[PDB]
Amino acid sequence: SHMRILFATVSEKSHLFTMVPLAWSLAAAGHEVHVASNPALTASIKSTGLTAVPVGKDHNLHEMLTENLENPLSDWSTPELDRHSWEQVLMKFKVSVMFAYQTYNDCMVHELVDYARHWQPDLVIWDPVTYAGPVAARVVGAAHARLLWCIDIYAKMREVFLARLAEQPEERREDPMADWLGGILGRYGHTFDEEVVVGQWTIDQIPTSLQLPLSLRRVPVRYLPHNGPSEIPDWLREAPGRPRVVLTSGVSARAALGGTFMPVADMINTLGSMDIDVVAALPPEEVEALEKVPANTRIVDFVPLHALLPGASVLIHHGGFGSWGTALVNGVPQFIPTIRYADWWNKGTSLHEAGAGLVVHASELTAEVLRESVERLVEDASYREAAERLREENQRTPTPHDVVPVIEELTAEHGR
């Protein structure tokens, strides 16, 4: 019967939007669903229809990032024993905890624990780098599960870490994740456990065929596009004269694209010279950039990506899940010029190896590569066919609706 369910996410709109269909599935089954994050994300939560719970204070991650992306210690794209000594994987955990996880989470973890103590959720569903979530859950005995937008490099890197940890003598064992999260749990009289790192189970929006196999309790769920507040405009109605090519700087990540590789304006100009229709979703920032707007190019601040991608031929993006997933469910071939940050590279590579799209490193992106890649995805039918196979795989996955009872049972099993 009736549950209180707390969603927890770091203050990224892009992360939040991946959680909205599952949150609404649970609300639609009669459960109370509250979404907690830093105050900066309150307005975004409120536009999802879901109840927002602002917790703690805003953090400095964006200043830290812009003032300094892809270096070997931030590269979790190849989480394999073969490529990690103990000290390499330990160092990755040390730096990811210090720079990313603590910045994202420490600003709100105590306030989240407080809210959980007051509200007493039966279940906490957490974005996979929102480790404040399982801490708060554990303190109040709630069941808790990750909800994945990601190729699961996090749990896979953890597996590598634990294999190497087991090879060390007792005195040389160190775990930055256990120190950090165990420290916080200790202050509330609770123990650390490995389930705070990977959840009691994992609800996974990545199609099984493209996901890394792991020793987890895994609940596959269908990705349903939610790209933030949307309306269908009048101009959308007229189905497309020639191949439609869509380009997003993303939903975040706009303002951390290095600057140091091929500019937005150069990409627009390349696409401007092609026999296609271009729709470019660009932020006021990079909109000021451009001298001309090509004849074949329409520019938008907001577009409902899910409404735009039906019938489109190509989506060009940095590997964010909103874009990746929405193109996937529409069977649209993807071109992903990106970096080894988060799982973006894996998002590109997974499609590339399946023959459903193309990945290239952002640093290697030229007008010639852009043009040739788009041409190939338009002309070579093998791309659409492979994309269509992935579309069908998504379509066979149980919906949020279908997994509601599974989540209910798992909560009963693992919670208070």
Add this chain to the structure above:
Amino acid sequence: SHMRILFATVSEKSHLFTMVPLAWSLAAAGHEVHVASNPALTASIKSTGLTAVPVGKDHNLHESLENPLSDWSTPELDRHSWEQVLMKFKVSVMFAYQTYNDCMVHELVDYARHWQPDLVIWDPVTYAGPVAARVVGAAHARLLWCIDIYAKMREVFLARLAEQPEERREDPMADWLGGILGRYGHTFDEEVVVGQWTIDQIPTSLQLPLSLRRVPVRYLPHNGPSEIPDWLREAPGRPRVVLTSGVSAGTFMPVADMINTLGSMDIDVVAALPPEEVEALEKVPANTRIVDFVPLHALLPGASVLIHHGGFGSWGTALVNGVPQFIPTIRYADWWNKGTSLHEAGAGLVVHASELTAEVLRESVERLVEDASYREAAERLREENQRTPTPHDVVPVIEELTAEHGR
């Protein structure tokens, strides 16, 4: 299989919010759900997480409320001659339904032709909805926020129509909607008035019995964009009394007089009030907190009384929280029925707005706080709601009915 589902509502946020949980239930099952209304409501739709489709132009309804011809509170044969019920349909079509719908009906038909929804779910006075559905052969159903005075008055109307000689037959609803349908080459049918089926958020025990295909569904509060504030955490020292003007709100007792009465009582008061009635007050009593926004669903747990005009958001949210209601209201829409249904059940109190005095306000609140029979009856209705299938549970029913009745 995967459906395109078009929600249609008149441009009232209060109506829209009643539809949001069912819309999201269907979206969560993998269906595409678009919500169409006049452009003024696009911002509200977008804050629900649902995809908005602006259609047509904004209307002049805003630019006399309780009078006998607008009173559908007692839709009974016994109280309606043919000419009385005919006149009610003539005036409701001319003044309310056409104003709400004619500004967007053609644009909605156009959108339906383009998008080809399998199913249209319509707010019960959004007759543009079933017109658009019928034109494209879609299944369609009403989603009710209301004690169903609309379908009940229609039943009275049809009983009296059948008593008339052929020459004296007249149907303002058929003329209006049949006229529009005719221009697109389609027939009028009675199902455009009551839907192919009715999805009903009113607990069965409080709803008027009708000859309809009826799918009960649990009301889940959605009161628009909400956040939980810090001050809510401190559970209540004494009876909490909540007062909403609603989304409306003046020749009867003013808001300022109500606040002053409640200000003198041994209670905590939370008053959700709009800009100009906030300026209205000289003092704010010590026991009174004033808010522009409060998430009613978060506010009403542990509250003792909700005072409101009979809007469904308030009514339903108090109902699911087991909170006794005091409804000083008028015979507009189903507001009076919302009050009287609770009154007869012993779960709250209704009074006509014109009879509201400081003495009646004080005494009614005291009774709902002190007499435990009110909380107990409210709690029974809470439990009745809780036994109703959720939007989640009725998704398959809606799928099957769409297959049965649609293309």
